[PDB]
């Protein structure tokens, strides 16, 4: 991977736990690295997340099979244990496999029902999500959305609030209330925080959000009769491509789940129409030819660009 160290050392969601069943092999793609995810058939077995590559002759291990707590390459049958060490070369069954016979392994943790991966050296914890432990809140997951846009443009779009009346009219916006009041934004060691903001839907909700790290956002909305939170997680496939997922929790009736998912789906697809059209693909930082213009209601998206530059992000941006 050629991503910046600041990106390499963070945790990213790559899958839902429910999709990584015992005995299964699945794949993902993170910061330009192809990943294989596997579990032994044993109940409660851990998830291994490795680079999807057999170092013998360069075959994807995801093309193999899980047997007896090992992942077995399809080409010459080399067997790799849970730690990624080759323990058996069938052509030479009494030989001790060379030390180089070892899959590239990465850090993996399950949290909030999601599979989190760190390709580097974890310097931080997985982002917090306080309502996960609050049994007054129900939970639901959106499907995943594959987006042909930089992961930082994806997050930029979700920090933006002034677009609501124009592409989310009815759910998040009112074309008769397109004015945007003064925004409160802070960037510090807790990350990027937008203060409480009044949303007009054509009722009136109060919204705020925080990003402790650049590609995960915690979003909180209070309506009249209900509070809705979510954890937005962007998988940075590479500089130009993203996966998007939401874990949503709410303290109203359980029966609202389908309507919530439907509203999110409508809004997300409205945003994707814009995201797929933006040029340049990578997010421009502060300094397809004219440079970006910023107005006061861009205060939070300007702060996001400033934050990325302070962090040293060069991957997925321009």
């Amino acid at each position: 991977t050629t991503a910046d160290l600041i990106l390499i050392n963070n945790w990213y969601v790559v899958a839902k736990v429910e999709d990584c069943r015992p005995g299964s092999i699945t794949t993902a793609h993170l910061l330009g690295v192809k990943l294989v995810l596997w579990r032994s058939h044993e109940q409660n077995s851990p998830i291994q997340v490795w680079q999807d590559y057999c170092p013998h002759r360069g075959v994807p291990l995801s093309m193999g099979e899980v047997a007896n707590n090992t992942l077995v390459c399809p080409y010459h049958g080399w067997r790799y244990n849970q730690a990624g060490k080759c323990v058996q070369i069938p052509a030479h069954p009494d030989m001790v496999p060379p030390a180089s016979a070892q899959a590239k392994t990465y850090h993996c943790q399950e949290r909030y029902g999601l599979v989190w991966v760190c390709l580097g050296n974890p310097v931080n914890d997985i982002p917090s999500f306080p309502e996960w432990d609050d049994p007054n809140y129900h939970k639901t997951y959106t499907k995943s959305y594959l987006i042909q846009a930089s992961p930082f443009r994806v997050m930029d779009n979700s920090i933006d609030v002034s677009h609501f009346p124009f592409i989310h009219e009815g759910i998040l916006g009112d074309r008769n209330h397109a004015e945007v009041e003064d925004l409160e934004v802070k960037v510090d060691k807790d990350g990027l925080t937008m203060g409480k903001y009044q949303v007009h839907t054509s009722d009136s909700m109060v919204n705020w959000f925080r990003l402790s790290h650049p590609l995960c956002q915690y979003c909180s909305t209070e309506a009249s009769e209900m509070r809705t939170v979510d954890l937005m997680v962007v998988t940075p496939i590479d500089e130009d491509n993203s996966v998007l997922r939401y874990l949503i929790m709410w303290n109203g009736s359980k029966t609202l789940e389908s309507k919530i998912l439907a509203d999110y789906d409508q809004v997300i697809e409205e945003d994707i129409r814009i995201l797929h059209s933006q040029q340049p693909t990578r997010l421009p930082l502060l300094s397809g030819l004219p440079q970006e213009i910023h107005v006061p209601s861009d205060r939070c998206t300007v702060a996001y660009r400033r934050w990325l530059k302070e962090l040293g992000v060069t991957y997925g941006v321009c």
Copy 2:
């Protein structure tokens, strides 16, 4: 755009006027640039031609809407007046938009029912088409042909006459009458001219006399050709316009006028379409894509019947064209 200045400062057709209704938003591409063409809902409203790009967050303005004689970006609703100046930012409705909030605008003229665009500073006039105002002549437009070939190879193939008996058997030639007489070619202050040339066509109607077509053409600029043909009963002229999408891709259109019966329009359009598609089969195949000028594949060979296509290549070098050529 890496196009040469001599190309940037010229006029090119990007659309037919009749396909650009009031209130409409049309996309096109020219010399590597993405364009948006829009009109207000007022009748006889002019056509604006701008780079298709909102300078706020980089969204195509063509994804927006036309309202109150402005083009409105879909993302945050900034409204751009006919001059391309942002006159309204909805998030801050009492704020004067910054002077930088301005679309890149280009020159547009309507002429002969065609939308002409100049991306630079118009040195030249739009090419002349004398029959346009002659009521003895009817008019028709071909469809637009999208061609995966350099615009200069598209025009090279229209200047070429010796191919007629081989890929246009019937409408423009016959394979047993393939010899090419000496050609009159001039490159001068009027551009490139091929003088009157006898075209030998295959007979179709056995009751009638030979067609005995005499053709000539002139290019005052390198991607527009004025073509004139006298046949047995009538004169047919056309204006051929090549849109240089980029170095390797072209749109081709003809405006055709004739002083015979209006009822011939179907035969004319079908004959043009048959010939054009025969030419496209060759154009798509030619390598290198870009037109070789005079100087790993071997060099082009030239014979006497290539006099006008050689002259075209020499003219392009004189003009300084480097874009779409090699």
Copy 3:
């Protein structure tokens, strides 16, 4: 072309003679060069192999037609004789074509029912195939296989024997017999030879093979008094793409032919599954994604990589 002179000056198969009937026009691609193959309508006419290019206005001659003993370009009807000389320019029927009016022609020989081409100046003869002349041997031909992999990776995969029990189980091995004996490998002026080797399916066969040149392999298998030999010929389309063909001869029953053809098709498709997945695309050579690992049963594929470097191959390898 950017291919090495050592590759340019060798012979490659580009077609089966059965693919090129009298009067036909066919295309092929070799070392980056587009080829046209044509024959006059006469009985037993020779095959011309030229660069697929009319030097007048750059049209592929393969879009033309064969007329008399000439290939006629579709655009302006220039006529090229069997030597590639333009003999008629129809616009100027009494004019002697300029000397430059000439197709680029290549060396071509038919041998073993295959069309061999040398783009350069051939320093070697076409490889030997002793059984061709033996009336005790029947012959058959596989179809041609277009493979999105380097021609040197295709040949590497056919030199590899330890993969037999894992991707060719039931034809060339089985997983209960995966151990690989000490291999006999020699590289000298004859090229690369693998000495006789036991193949499992007693239930066993004896195999050996030899490459006089890097992209053609002679292979010999004996089992139950029947012998099967083949000539494997790889067409190096460019650095990343190959055509694969086999000429097979055997001295058992004629009725084995469809079974032989079916077995080869299964094995080849089993190999293509692996070949298409391998990264990098080009064959990695030895060094003086992690680097390849080599174990004793890789002795002959290691020797292949060593040979290619010693020959100075840079095209299709890394």
